[PDB]
mmCIF file of C-alpha atoms in Angstrom:
data_model
loop_
_atom_site.group_PDB
_atom_site.id
_atom_site.type_symbol
_atom_site.label_atom_id
_atom_site.label_comp_id
_atom_site.label_asym_id
_atom_site.label_seq_id
_atom_site.Cartn_x
_atom_site.Cartn_y
_atom_site.Cartn_z
ATOM 1 C CA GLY A 1 -1.482 -92.039 112.622
ATOM 2 C CA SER A 2 -4.071 -94.906 110.588
ATOM 3 C CA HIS A 3 -3.399 -95.681 106.081
ATOM 4 C CA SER A 4 -4.396 -97.422 103.752
ATOM 5 C CA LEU A 5 -3.887 -98.845 100.171
ATOM 6 C CA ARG A 6 -7.004 -99.121 97.853
ATOM 7 C CA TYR A 7 -7.667 -99.334 93.856
ATOM 8 C CA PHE A 8 -10.114 -98.170 91.589
ATOM 9 C CA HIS A 9 -11.651 -100.323 88.873
ATOM 10 C CA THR A 10 -14.006 -98.378 86.270
ATOM 11 C CA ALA A 11 -15.123 -100.705 83.168
ATOM 12 C CA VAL A 12 -17.428 -99.268 80.377
ATOM 13 C CA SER A 13 -19.357 -101.351 77.596
ATOM 14 C CA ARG A 14 -18.300 -99.595 73.985
ATOM 15 C CA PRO A 15 -21.251 -101.009 71.563
ATOM 16 C CA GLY A 16 -19.651 -101.599 68.782
ATOM 17 C CA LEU A 17 -16.006 -101.580 69.509
ATOM 18 C CA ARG A 18 -13.729 -104.529 70.014
ATOM 19 C CA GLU A 19 -13.417 -103.751 73.568
ATOM 20 C CA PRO A 20 -14.003 -102.269 77.094
ATOM 21 C CA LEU A 21 -12.902 -98.931 78.343
ATOM 22 C CA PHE A 22 -10.501 -100.694 81.485
ATOM 23 C CA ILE A 23 -9.302 -98.285 83.949
ATOM 24 C CA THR A 24 -7.161 -98.746 87.347
ATOM 25 C CA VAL A 25 -6.084 -96.316 89.493
ATOM 26 C CA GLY A 26 -4.522 -96.908 92.816
ATOM 27 C CA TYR A 27 -3.884 -94.877 95.961
ATOM 28 C CA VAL A 28 -2.211 -94.922 99.348
ATOM 29 C CA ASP A 29 -4.286 -92.383 101.669
ATOM 30 C CA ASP A 30 -4.965 -89.537 99.205
ATOM 31 C CA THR A 31 -1.912 -89.905 96.536
ATOM 32 C CA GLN A 32 -2.299 -91.146 93.529
ATOM 33 C CA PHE A 33 0.470 -93.901 92.660
ATOM 34 C CA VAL A 34 -0.165 -95.725 89.945
ATOM 35 C CA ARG A 35 -2.522 -96.500 87.042
ATOM 36 C CA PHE A 36 -3.119 -98.664 83.576
ATOM 37 C CA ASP A 37 -5.956 -97.397 80.928
ATOM 38 C CA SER A 38 -6.402 -100.169 78.435
ATOM 39 C CA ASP A 39 -6.459 -98.023 75.825
ATOM 40 C CA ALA A 40 -3.432 -96.795 76.214
ATOM 41 C CA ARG A 41 -0.786 -97.163 72.859
ATOM 42 C CA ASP A 42 1.032 -100.159 74.914
ATOM 43 C CA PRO A 43 -0.947 -100.137 78.158
ATOM 44 C CA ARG A 44 0.842 -100.472 80.659
ATOM 45 C CA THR A 45 0.705 -99.635 84.752
ATOM 46 C CA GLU A 46 3.006 -96.371 85.526
ATOM 47 C CA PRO A 47 3.944 -94.669 87.869
ATOM 48 C CA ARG A 48 2.334 -91.631 88.851
ATOM 49 C CA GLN A 49 4.133 -90.853 91.827
ATOM 50 C CA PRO A 50 8.540 -90.199 91.141
ATOM 51 C CA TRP A 51 9.134 -92.186 94.455
ATOM 52 C CA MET A 52 7.641 -95.781 92.120
ATOM 53 C CA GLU A 53 11.100 -95.974 90.306
ATOM 54 C CA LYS A 54 11.927 -97.613 92.735
ATOM 55 C CA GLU A 55 10.013 -100.595 91.826
ATOM 56 C CA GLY A 56 11.960 -102.312 89.329
ATOM 57 C CA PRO A 57 11.027 -103.849 86.239
ATOM 58 C CA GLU A 58 8.951 -107.105 87.293
ATOM 59 C CA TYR A 59 6.925 -105.193 89.601
ATOM 60 C CA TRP A 60 5.339 -103.561 86.418
ATOM 61 C CA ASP A 61 5.396 -106.087 84.191
ATOM 62 C CA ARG A 62 3.091 -108.213 86.829
ATOM 63 C CA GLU A 63 1.049 -105.208 87.735
ATOM 64 C CA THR A 64 0.683 -104.861 83.683
ATOM 65 C CA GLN A 65 -0.271 -108.778 83.391
ATOM 66 C CA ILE A 66 -2.591 -108.762 86.018
ATOM 67 C CA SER A 67 -3.979 -105.713 84.553
ATOM 68 C CA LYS A 68 -4.675 -107.285 81.362
ATOM 69 C CA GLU A 69 -6.436 -110.377 82.898
ATOM 70 C CA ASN A 70 -8.489 -107.804 85.191
ATOM 71 C CA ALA A 71 -9.947 -106.118 81.242
ATOM 72 C CA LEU A 72 -10.792 -109.517 80.080
ATOM 73 C CA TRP A 73 -12.596 -110.517 83.533
ATOM 74 C CA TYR A 74 -14.455 -107.244 83.339
ATOM 75 C CA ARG A 75 -15.468 -107.307 79.602
ATOM 76 C CA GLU A 76 -16.999 -111.183 80.689
ATOM 77 C CA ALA A 77 -18.731 -109.327 83.912
ATOM 78 C CA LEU A 78 -20.320 -107.004 81.826
ATOM 79 C CA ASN A 79 -21.801 -108.973 79.482
ATOM 80 C CA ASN A 80 -23.135 -111.405 82.625
ATOM 81 C CA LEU A 81 -24.826 -108.029 84.342
ATOM 82 C CA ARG A 82 -26.112 -107.190 81.272
ATOM 83 C CA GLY A 83 -27.829 -110.243 80.918
ATOM 84 C CA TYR A 84 -29.387 -110.366 84.790
ATOM 85 C CA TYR A 85 -30.964 -106.922 84.065
ATOM 86 C CA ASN A 86 -32.393 -108.080 80.137
ATOM 87 C CA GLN A 87 -30.147 -104.802 78.683
ATOM 88 C CA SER A 88 -29.177 -104.844 75.152
ATOM 89 C CA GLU A 89 -25.463 -104.955 74.367
ATOM 90 C CA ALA A 90 -26.717 -101.346 72.333
ATOM 91 C CA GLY A 91 -26.579 -99.497 75.371
ATOM 92 C CA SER A 92 -22.984 -98.389 77.393
ATOM 93 C CA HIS A 93 -23.057 -99.293 81.270
ATOM 94 C CA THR A 94 -20.367 -98.967 84.026
ATOM 95 C CA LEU A 95 -19.072 -101.653 86.766
ATOM 96 C CA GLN A 96 -16.757 -100.110 89.209
ATOM 97 C CA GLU A 97 -14.940 -101.698 91.849
ATOM 98 C CA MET A 98 -12.828 -100.530 95.199
ATOM 99 C CA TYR A 99 -10.572 -102.560 97.044
ATOM 100 C CA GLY A 100 -8.062 -102.690 99.688
ATOM 101 C CA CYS A 101 -6.861 -102.632 102.983
ATOM 102 C CA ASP A 102 -6.529 -99.859 106.125
ATOM 103 C CA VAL A 103 -3.842 -99.782 108.411
ATOM 104 C CA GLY A 104 -3.224 -98.869 112.036
ATOM 105 C CA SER A 105 -0.192 -97.085 113.203
ATOM 106 C CA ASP A 106 0.424 -100.290 114.496
ATOM 107 C CA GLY A 107 0.916 -101.443 110.869
ATOM 108 C CA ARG A 108 -2.069 -104.511 110.736
ATOM 109 C CA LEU A 109 -4.841 -104.922 109.007
ATOM 110 C CA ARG A 110 -7.726 -102.741 110.776
ATOM 111 C CA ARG A 111 -10.212 -103.637 107.460
ATOM 112 C CA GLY A 112 -10.512 -104.675 104.260
ATOM 113 C CA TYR A 113 -13.040 -103.521 101.325
ATOM 114 C CA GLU A 114 -14.039 -105.000 98.162
ATOM 115 C CA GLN A 115 -17.055 -103.555 96.392
ATOM 116 C CA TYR A 116 -18.528 -103.204 93.148
ATOM 117 C CA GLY A 117 -21.174 -100.780 91.675
ATOM 118 C CA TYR A 118 -23.267 -101.112 88.539
ATOM 119 C CA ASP A 119 -24.052 -98.229 86.570
ATOM 120 C CA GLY A 120 -24.012 -95.574 89.685
ATOM 121 C CA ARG A 121 -25.246 -97.702 92.646
ATOM 122 C CA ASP A 122 -24.267 -100.439 95.095
ATOM 123 C CA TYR A 123 -23.614 -104.101 93.756
ATOM 124 C CA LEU A 124 -22.569 -106.110 95.490
ATOM 125 C CA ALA A 125 -19.746 -106.176 98.664
ATOM 126 C CA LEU A 126 -17.545 -108.371 100.642
ATOM 127 C CA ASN A 127 -18.540 -107.723 104.759
ATOM 128 C CA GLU A 128 -16.180 -106.505 106.740
ATOM 129 C CA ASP A 129 -16.131 -109.930 108.491
ATOM 130 C CA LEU A 130 -14.323 -111.006 105.033
ATOM 131 C CA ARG A 131 -16.496 -114.208 104.156
ATOM 132 C CA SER A 132 -19.938 -113.389 103.738
ATOM 133 C CA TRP A 133 -21.586 -111.074 100.723
ATOM 134 C CA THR A 134 -24.273 -108.459 100.854
ATOM 135 C CA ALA A 135 -25.799 -108.528 97.353
ATOM 136 C CA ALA A 136 -28.091 -105.517 96.810
ATOM 137 C CA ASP A 137 -31.139 -107.247 94.717
ATOM 138 C CA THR A 138 -31.634 -110.629 93.023
ATOM 139 C CA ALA A 139 -29.294 -109.927 90.025
ATOM 140 C CA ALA A 140 -26.672 -109.292 92.809
ATOM 141 C CA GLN A 141 -27.900 -112.720 94.223
ATOM 142 C CA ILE A 142 -26.664 -114.951 91.208
ATOM 143 C CA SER A 143 -23.138 -112.887 91.732
ATOM 144 C CA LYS A 144 -23.229 -113.789 95.374
ATOM 145 C CA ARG A 145 -23.829 -117.188 94.415
ATOM 146 C CA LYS A 146 -21.454 -117.651 91.972
ATOM 147 C CA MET A 147 -18.457 -115.879 94.505
ATOM 148 C CA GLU A 148 -20.083 -118.628 97.593
ATOM 149 C CA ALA A 149 -19.305 -121.552 94.904
ATOM 150 C CA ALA A 150 -16.797 -120.080 93.693
ATOM 151 C CA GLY A 151 -15.073 -119.657 96.949
ATOM 152 C CA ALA A 152 -13.764 -115.956 95.998
ATOM 153 C CA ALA A 153 -13.823 -114.383 100.056
ATOM 154 C CA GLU A 154 -10.860 -117.094 100.785
ATOM 155 C CA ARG A 155 -8.562 -115.712 98.419
ATOM 156 C CA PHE A 156 -9.411 -112.266 99.196
ATOM 157 C CA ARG A 157 -9.159 -112.797 102.416
ATOM 158 C CA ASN A 158 -5.347 -113.921 101.928
ATOM 159 C CA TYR A 159 -4.942 -110.730 99.692
ATOM 160 C CA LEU A 160 -5.679 -108.667 102.297
ATOM 161 C CA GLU A 161 -4.602 -110.239 104.991
ATOM 162 C CA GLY A 162 -1.418 -110.789 103.714
ATOM 163 C CA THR A 163 -0.247 -109.034 100.494
ATOM 164 C CA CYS A 164 -2.140 -105.826 100.691
ATOM 165 C CA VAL A 165 -1.327 -105.033 104.106
ATOM 166 C CA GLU A 166 2.926 -105.726 103.408
ATOM 167 C CA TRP A 167 2.841 -103.718 100.058
ATOM 168 C CA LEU A 168 1.164 -100.643 101.812
ATOM 169 C CA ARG A 169 3.949 -100.745 104.328
ATOM 170 C CA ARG A 170 7.088 -101.213 101.526
ATOM 171 C CA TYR A 171 4.843 -98.071 99.806
ATOM 172 C CA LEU A 172 4.548 -95.840 103.056
ATOM 173 C CA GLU A 173 8.852 -96.661 103.539
ATOM 174 C CA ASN A 174 8.925 -95.936 99.558
ATOM 175 C CA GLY A 175 7.166 -92.735 99.859
ATOM 176 C CA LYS A 176 7.928 -91.249 103.071
ATOM 177 C CA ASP A 177 8.739 -88.048 102.465
ATOM 178 C CA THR A 178 5.664 -87.735 100.372
ATOM 179 C CA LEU A 179 3.026 -89.694 102.285
ATOM 180 C CA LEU A 180 3.997 -89.386 106.057
ATOM 181 C CA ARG A 181 3.438 -85.694 105.629
ATOM 182 C CA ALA A 182 0.809 -83.051 107.190
ATOM 183 C CA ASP A 183 1.166 -79.954 105.161
ATOM 184 C CA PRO A 184 -1.198 -77.923 107.110
ATOM 185 C CA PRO A 185 -3.630 -74.958 104.975
ATOM 186 C CA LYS A 186 -2.471 -71.216 104.342
ATOM 187 C CA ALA A 187 -5.667 -70.089 104.949
ATOM 188 C CA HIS A 188 -6.861 -66.654 104.304
ATOM 189 C CA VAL A 189 -10.204 -64.496 104.480
ATOM 190 C CA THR A 190 -10.689 -62.599 101.324
ATOM 191 C CA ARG A 191 -13.636 -60.478 100.457
ATOM 192 C CA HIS A 192 -15.563 -59.243 97.539
ATOM 193 C CA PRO A 193 -18.466 -56.554 97.814
ATOM 194 C CA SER A 194 -21.377 -56.167 95.635
ATOM 195 C CA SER A 195 -22.673 -53.756 96.532
ATOM 196 C CA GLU A 196 -22.507 -51.271 100.052
ATOM 197 C CA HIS A 197 -25.084 -53.011 102.349
ATOM 198 C CA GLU A 198 -23.742 -57.024 101.573
ATOM 199 C CA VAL A 199 -20.243 -58.192 100.924
ATOM 200 C CA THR A 200 -19.156 -61.518 100.666
ATOM 201 C CA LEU A 201 -16.374 -62.481 102.769
ATOM 202 C CA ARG A 202 -14.141 -65.744 101.379
ATOM 203 C CA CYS A 203 -11.836 -68.499 103.228
ATOM 204 C CA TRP A 204 -9.652 -70.049 101.373
ATOM 205 C CA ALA A 205 -7.525 -72.500 103.018
ATOM 206 C CA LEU A 206 -4.734 -73.909 100.192
ATOM 207 C CA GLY A 207 -2.310 -76.320 100.000
ATOM 208 C CA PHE A 208 -2.826 -78.740 102.419
ATOM 209 C CA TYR A 209 -2.268 -82.250 102.279
ATOM 210 C CA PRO A 210 -3.864 -84.779 103.423
ATOM 211 C CA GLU A 211 -8.232 -84.271 102.073
ATOM 212 C CA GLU A 212 -9.260 -84.099 104.885
ATOM 213 C CA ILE A 213 -10.641 -80.513 106.297
ATOM 214 C CA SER A 214 -13.333 -78.212 108.294
ATOM 215 C CA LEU A 215 -14.538 -75.148 107.147
ATOM 216 C CA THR A 216 -16.512 -72.817 109.163
ATOM 217 C CA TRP A 217 -17.878 -69.477 109.373
ATOM 218 C CA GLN A 218 -18.942 -68.229 113.055
ATOM 219 C CA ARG A 219 -20.931 -64.887 114.056
ATOM 220 C CA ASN A 220 -20.656 -64.991 117.974
ATOM 221 C CA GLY A 221 -20.152 -68.799 119.039
ATOM 222 C CA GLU A 222 -22.936 -69.283 116.787
ATOM 223 C CA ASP A 223 -22.123 -71.463 113.442
ATOM 224 C CA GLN A 224 -22.786 -70.339 110.416
ATOM 225 C CA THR A 225 -23.469 -73.378 108.222
ATOM 226 C CA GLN A 226 -26.865 -73.136 106.989
ATOM 227 C CA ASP A 227 -25.723 -69.487 105.154
ATOM 228 C CA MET A 228 -22.592 -70.040 103.700
ATOM 229 C CA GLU A 229 -21.469 -71.635 100.361
ATOM 230 C CA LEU A 230 -19.062 -74.454 100.753
ATOM 231 C CA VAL A 231 -17.242 -76.003 98.132
ATOM 232 C CA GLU A 232 -15.939 -79.492 97.303
ATOM 233 C CA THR A 233 -12.565 -79.842 98.479
ATOM 234 C CA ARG A 234 -10.262 -79.511 94.810
ATOM 235 C CA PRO A 235 -6.967 -80.701 93.576
ATOM 236 C CA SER A 236 -4.233 -78.211 93.244
ATOM 237 C CA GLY A 237 -2.545 -80.311 90.696
ATOM 238 C CA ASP A 238 0.327 -80.957 92.217
ATOM 239 C CA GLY A 239 -0.558 -83.332 95.260
ATOM 240 C CA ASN A 240 -2.183 -81.136 97.519
ATOM 241 C CA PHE A 241 -5.540 -79.884 98.290
ATOM 242 C CA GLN A 242 -7.714 -76.650 98.327
ATOM 243 C CA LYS A 243 -10.890 -75.120 99.897
ATOM 244 C CA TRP A 244 -12.820 -72.428 100.471
ATOM 245 C CA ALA A 245 -16.451 -71.021 102.107
ATOM 246 C CA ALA A 246 -17.968 -68.073 101.057
ATOM 247 C CA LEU A 247 -20.828 -66.061 103.268
ATOM 248 C CA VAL A 248 -22.440 -62.953 102.845
ATOM 249 C CA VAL A 249 -22.025 -60.686 105.670
ATOM 250 C CA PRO A 250 -23.420 -56.857 106.037
ATOM 251 C CA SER A 251 -20.904 -53.946 105.078
ATOM 252 C CA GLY A 252 -18.943 -52.965 107.951
ATOM 253 C CA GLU A 253 -19.753 -55.516 110.254
ATOM 254 C CA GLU A 254 -17.163 -57.936 108.749
ATOM 255 C CA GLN A 255 -15.161 -58.611 111.924
ATOM 256 C CA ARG A 256 -17.869 -59.529 113.903
ATOM 257 C CA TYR A 257 -17.462 -63.062 111.550
ATOM 258 C CA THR A 258 -14.684 -65.891 112.006
ATOM 259 C CA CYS A 259 -13.473 -68.582 109.805
ATOM 260 C CA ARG A 260 -12.457 -71.626 111.754
ATOM 261 C CA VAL A 261 -10.316 -73.401 109.885
ATOM 262 C CA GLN A 262 -9.026 -77.646 111.718
ATOM 263 C CA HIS A 263 -6.457 -79.387 109.782
ATOM 264 C CA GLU A 264 -5.056 -82.375 110.993
ATOM 265 C CA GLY A 265 -1.138 -80.102 109.664
ATOM 266 C CA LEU A 266 -2.139 -77.921 112.143
ATOM 267 C CA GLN A 267 -1.624 -78.075 115.917
ATOM 268 C CA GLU A 268 -4.634 -75.952 116.916
ATOM 269 C CA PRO A 269 -7.478 -74.665 114.707
ATOM 270 C CA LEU A 270 -6.741 -71.406 113.188
ATOM 271 C CA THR A 271 -9.194 -68.779 113.572
ATOM 272 C CA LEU A 272 -9.350 -65.934 110.684
ATOM 273 C CA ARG A 273 -11.192 -62.069 110.172
ATOM 274 C CA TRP A 274 -11.126 -60.418 106.602
ATOM 275 C CA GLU A 275 -8.155 -58.464 107.466
ATOM 276 C CA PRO A 276 -7.605 -54.944 105.936
ATOM 277 C CA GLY A 277 -4.313 -55.270 103.135
ATOM 278 C CA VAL B 1 0.325 -104.013 94.510
ATOM 279 C CA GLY B 2 -3.094 -105.094 93.324
ATOM 280 C CA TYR B 3 -5.333 -107.984 93.468
ATOM 281 C CA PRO B 4 -5.685 -110.566 90.239
ATOM 282 C CA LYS B 5 -8.887 -111.227 89.268
ATOM 283 C CA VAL B 6 -9.781 -115.715 87.864
ATOM 284 C CA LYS B 7 -12.405 -116.073 85.310
ATOM 285 C CA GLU B 8 -13.459 -118.795 87.677
ATOM 286 C CA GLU B 9 -14.267 -116.164 90.792
ATOM 287 C CA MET B 10 -17.338 -114.567 87.744
ATOM 288 C CA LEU B 11 -19.733 -112.197 88.827
ATOM 289 C CA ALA C 1 -31.441 -94.828 84.936
ATOM 290 C CA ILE C 2 -29.028 -93.080 87.160
ATOM 291 C CA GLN C 3 -27.574 -89.967 85.383
ATOM 292 C CA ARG C 4 -25.845 -87.379 87.811
ATOM 293 C CA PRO C 5 -24.659 -83.900 86.658
ATOM 294 C CA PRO C 6 -21.125 -82.505 87.381
ATOM 295 C CA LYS C 7 -19.971 -79.924 89.176
ATOM 296 C CA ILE C 8 -17.510 -77.298 87.858
ATOM 297 C CA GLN C 9 -15.029 -75.761 89.572
ATOM 298 C CA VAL C 10 -12.448 -73.851 87.044
ATOM 299 C CA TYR C 11 -9.096 -72.236 88.836
ATOM 300 C CA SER C 12 -5.617 -71.766 88.701
ATOM 301 C CA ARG C 13 -3.254 -73.664 90.537
ATOM 302 C CA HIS C 14 -1.579 -70.429 92.120
ATOM 303 C CA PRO C 15 -3.184 -67.403 92.973
ATOM 304 C CA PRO C 16 -2.884 -65.198 89.435
ATOM 305 C CA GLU C 17 -0.630 -62.615 88.581
ATOM 306 C CA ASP C 18 -0.052 -61.272 85.356
ATOM 307 C CA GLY C 19 3.544 -62.505 83.933
ATOM 308 C CA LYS C 20 3.855 -64.800 86.016
ATOM 309 C CA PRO C 21 3.396 -68.752 84.879
ATOM 310 C CA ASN C 22 0.992 -70.747 86.287
ATOM 311 C CA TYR C 23 -1.028 -73.717 85.700
ATOM 312 C CA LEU C 24 -5.073 -73.677 85.144
ATOM 313 C CA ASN C 25 -7.612 -76.341 86.765
ATOM 314 C CA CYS C 26 -10.614 -77.532 85.442
ATOM 315 C CA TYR C 27 -11.955 -79.902 88.200
ATOM 316 C CA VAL C 28 -15.378 -81.689 86.943
ATOM 317 C CA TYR C 29 -16.534 -83.765 89.354
ATOM 318 C CA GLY C 30 -20.155 -85.872 91.011
ATOM 319 C CA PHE C 31 -20.590 -86.913 87.792
ATOM 320 C CA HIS C 32 -21.999 -90.276 86.077
ATOM 321 C CA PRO C 33 -22.385 -91.825 83.744
ATOM 322 C CA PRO C 34 -18.577 -91.312 82.923
ATOM 323 C CA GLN C 35 -18.035 -90.550 78.989
ATOM 324 C CA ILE C 36 -17.584 -86.603 79.120
ATOM 325 C CA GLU C 37 -15.404 -83.900 77.829
ATOM 326 C CA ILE C 38 -13.869 -80.993 79.546
ATOM 327 C CA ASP C 39 -11.535 -78.456 77.199
ATOM 328 C CA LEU C 40 -10.395 -75.674 77.914
ATOM 329 C CA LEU C 41 -11.134 -72.953 76.123
ATOM 330 C CA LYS C 42 -8.793 -69.412 76.013
ATOM 331 C CA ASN C 43 -10.270 -66.561 74.460
ATOM 332 C CA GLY C 44 -13.189 -68.858 73.073
ATOM 333 C CA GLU C 45 -10.794 -71.785 71.713
ATOM 334 C CA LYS C 46 -9.467 -75.025 72.730
ATOM 335 C CA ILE C 47 -6.092 -74.959 73.663
ATOM 336 C CA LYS C 48 -3.846 -77.849 74.826
ATOM 337 C CA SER C 49 -4.214 -79.575 77.578
ATOM 338 C CA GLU C 50 -3.580 -82.767 79.756
ATOM 339 C CA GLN C 51 -6.460 -84.780 81.718
ATOM 340 C CA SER C 52 -6.117 -87.041 84.825
ATOM 341 C CA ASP C 53 -6.711 -90.679 85.080
ATOM 342 C CA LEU C 54 -10.400 -91.215 85.773
ATOM 343 C CA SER C 55 -11.110 -91.963 89.479
ATOM 344 C CA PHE C 56 -14.021 -92.028 91.789
ATOM 345 C CA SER C 57 -15.490 -90.997 94.388
ATOM 346 C CA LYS C 58 -17.410 -93.726 98.017
ATOM 347 C CA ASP C 59 -20.884 -92.649 96.253
ATOM 348 C CA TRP C 60 -19.273 -93.969 92.698
ATOM 349 C CA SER C 61 -19.493 -90.294 91.058
ATOM 350 C CA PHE C 62 -16.218 -89.810 88.737
ATOM 351 C CA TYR C 63 -13.938 -86.347 89.029
ATOM 352 C CA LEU C 64 -11.195 -85.886 86.666
ATOM 353 C CA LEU C 65 -8.923 -82.610 86.656
ATOM 354 C CA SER C 66 -8.551 -80.736 83.043
ATOM 355 C CA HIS C 67 -4.928 -79.030 83.426
ATOM 356 C CA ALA C 68 -3.151 -76.526 81.651
ATOM 357 C CA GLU C 69 0.333 -74.118 81.678
ATOM 358 C CA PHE C 70 -0.808 -70.913 81.147
ATOM 359 C CA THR C 71 0.580 -67.597 81.946
ATOM 360 C CA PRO C 72 -2.196 -65.115 82.830
ATOM 361 C CA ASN C 73 -1.888 -61.472 81.468
ATOM 362 C CA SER C 74 -4.666 -58.283 81.578
ATOM 363 C CA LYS C 75 -5.879 -59.572 78.387
ATOM 364 C CA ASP C 76 -6.784 -63.053 78.009
ATOM 365 C CA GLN C 77 -10.201 -64.858 79.219
ATOM 366 C CA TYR C 78 -10.280 -68.316 79.679
ATOM 367 C CA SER C 79 -12.948 -71.110 80.572
ATOM 368 C CA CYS C 80 -14.032 -74.638 80.584
ATOM 369 C CA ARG C 81 -16.587 -76.664 78.295
ATOM 370 C CA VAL C 82 -18.406 -79.212 79.712
ATOM 371 C CA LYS C 83 -20.405 -81.383 77.730
ATOM 372 C CA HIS C 84 -22.317 -85.199 78.915
ATOM 373 C CA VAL C 85 -25.241 -86.561 78.526
ATOM 374 C CA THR C 86 -27.296 -84.741 81.153
ATOM 375 C CA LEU C 87 -26.389 -81.599 79.348
ATOM 376 C CA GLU C 88 -28.374 -80.121 76.676
ATOM 377 C CA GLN C 89 -26.070 -78.110 75.793
ATOM 378 C CA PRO C 90 -22.817 -77.417 76.531
ATOM 379 C CA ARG C 91 -21.584 -75.609 79.599
ATOM 380 C CA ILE C 92 -19.098 -73.383 79.784
ATOM 381 C CA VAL C 93 -17.646 -71.752 83.222
ATOM 382 C CA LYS C 94 -15.094 -69.234 83.634
ATOM 383 C CA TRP C 95 -12.717 -68.934 85.333
ATOM 384 C CA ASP C 96 -13.292 -66.131 87.935
ATOM 385 C CA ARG C 97 -10.445 -64.981 88.727
ATOM 386 C CA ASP C 98 -11.131 -62.688 91.569
ATOM 387 C CA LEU C 99 -12.611 -65.714 93.660
#
């Protein structure tokens, strides 16, 4: 199995306050493991999993220090971007960044990422070659030129190929019980009759990890996705996920319809039907 | 661990 | 000019049953910009809740979970109220315990 370490920064300007809001969250696969929030009383990087308590106080202090400096960096970035776009300081804007590394089962760097978003759109991205950049427009071309003149890509490539991949290995060992599990969904179909003519069948998948899952409905080897409501996958609140797929069928034909659940924790796909009781 | 941003490498 | 309204699911962590402690969740996602207010209501009044750390998806849209421990029972009604720039008035989504 492949694995990822990813960090997510969000900077939000706040017209007439001393500082933007800066939040970082880190994830290994689909598990959140750290956070930093510039608005906390005494902002610090904090664990979000019990097994991160394995890291000593140097780890926390250092993550905290760079987060603070990151917050300063974002403040300047937000100012510069408004300049490029002739946007008044009176208005709030959002800069977002996602970055990290994917590693294969073989344990080595399969792919590195560094992407910026501005007011919800792609802005500037490090290419897969880890030495060139893609700018979304002429503002981002200014940022691209700055990154090229500074040689930013080189420093980031060094992180990815060393530090990133090495720490992900370590996190994967320290949280092995949490992180290396594949908890299959518990699945069942429930019945919800509006009238004597029509009933909604809801196929539920609960308690699963990791997030990726396939729920589909079939009638006779015939796929029903054009009639089904598929909700976005949602968190349990305790480190797992939940999802359902519903479709309206005629009363008395419930047994013609099957729900198929596919997930990494399942040896084979589940195929389920609504069952009396 | 995360990556430190430096002011010399600026958007 | 990118403004995406939130999508909202209200739900209990576990299949609900009267007198059994549980967790009430309001998952709010797909939204932009990130400023948002998310309140869990019990019979139309705000209860104490905690909120997850701001995070986002591949299309830059944000997601948050607002959650509270609760003990369901036959009388108490629950809902989640969301305020965002894309909503002309606050949106209230009722907890449907029979989904």
